[PDB]
């Protein structure tokens, strides 16, 4: 069950859930598989925080094993479009979309806990139909694979030939390895 929290503001006492209280501090949580419904909540949260303070930074915690590519793109495109710098902090796992959203944070604001694990693999897809339909969908999944590799290269600075080579198979990277790779900037250890 979600616990309740009391802010105890000067005007008076208010009761907010644990998640809503943190949202007041420009914090957004990404938990579970990425899908259209949960992804829409993140988009709404990002826009709302923008209006409250378009200058203050935002912190997006990412703990997900991946999910829908389209849902993830709606978040990534929203993070870059808005004015505030959306920080990113890995809290243990990012398989396919978690690393794209972890590496799509403002420069100097991508963190990772000491024992977090980050992976990167090519987008998986499933479709059935006629040969003509298969050829059409095959080109679409090949186009997406290229656009995703371009995003990582831009934020990480590595050449596209290396990204494509590393995304052919599942590649696990620790906190220290990710810094050299360019996925993140700093590894938070202690306060």
């Amino acid at each position: 069950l979600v616990p309740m929290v009391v802010e105890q503001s000067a005007r008076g006492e208010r009761a907010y859930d644990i998640y809503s209280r943190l949202l007041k501090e420009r914090i957004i949580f990404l938990v579970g598989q990425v899908e259209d419904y949960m992804a829409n909540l993140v988009v709404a949260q990002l826009l709302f925080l923008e209006a409250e303070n378009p200058e203050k930074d935002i912190h997006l915690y990412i703990n997900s094993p991946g999910g829908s590519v389209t849902a993830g793109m709606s978040i990534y495109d929203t993070m870059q479009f808005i004015k505030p710098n959306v920080s990113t902090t890995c809290i243990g796992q990012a398989c396919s979309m978690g690393a794209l959203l972890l590496a799509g944070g403002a420069a100097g604001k991508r963190y990772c806990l000491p024992h977090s694990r980050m992976m990167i693999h090519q987008p998986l897809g499933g479709f059935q139909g006629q040969a003509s339909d298969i050829e059409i969908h095959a080109k679409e999944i090949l186009f997406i694979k290229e656009r995703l590799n371009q995003i990582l290269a831009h934020h990480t600075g590595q050449p596209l030939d290396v990204i494509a080579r590393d995304t052919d198979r599942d590649r696990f990277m620790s906190g220290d390895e990710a810094v050299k790779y360019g996925l993140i900037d700093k590894v938070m250890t202690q306060r």
Partner: protein
């Protein structure tokens, strides 16, 4: 028991009956009979095809098996034919390829499903294209039309009745009784 019992007399008359979905089991039974009959004698073999479709890879075994054995196979189309049945239907020579009045034919592109990474999907896509190109070249040789014409018509489900199949070149002659068959 019914099958085994009837199979005793089925080998004397040399009449193979292809009925139902083309699956792995059908290929083993149909191919066994063809090789068995060829060992008994070189007399012609009558094949009745009625299938709504099935595995295309299974059809290839029956396709080449007809061409592999020495006796000429008489192909009689009855009921409903499809991608798997039409492939088998095109294995016999034109002069030995007959049909019935109420027979139907269907020519559509092969369909399948794939799940996994993009790299694996690309490999699967290439084979689907090669398979589609191979089937077009097969029906083209039997119908006499160019592969491009087959591909354009096969873009969607192309239904050809008994009469339209003759004009298309897939059927040689329609018959109603065995007396109308002309052996080589």
């Amino acid at each position: 028991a019914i099958g085994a019992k009837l199979m005793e007399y089925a080998l004397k008359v040399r009449k193979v009956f292809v009925t139902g979905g083309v699956d792995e089991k059908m290929a083993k039974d149909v191919v066994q009979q063809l090789h068995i009959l060829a060992s008994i004698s070189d007399d012609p073999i009558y094949m009745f095809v009625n299938s709504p479709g099935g595995h295309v890879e299974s059809g290839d075994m029956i396709f080449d098996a007809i061409r592999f054995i020495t006796p000429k196979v008489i192909m009689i189309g009855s009921g409903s034919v499809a991608s798997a049945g039409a492939l088998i239907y095109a294995a016999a020579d034109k002069e030995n390829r007959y049909s019935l009045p109420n027979t139907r034919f269907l020519l559509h592109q092969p369909s399948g499903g794939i799940q996994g990474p993009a790299s694996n999907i690309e490999i699967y896509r290439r084979e689907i294209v090669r398979m589609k190109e191979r089937l077009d070249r097969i029906f083209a040789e039997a119908t006499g039309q160019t592969p491009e014409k087959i591909s354009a018509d096969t873009e969607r489900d192309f239904w050809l009745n008994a009469e339209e199949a003759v004009q298309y070149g897939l059927v040689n002659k329609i018959i109603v009784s065995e007396r109308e068959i002309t052996l080589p």
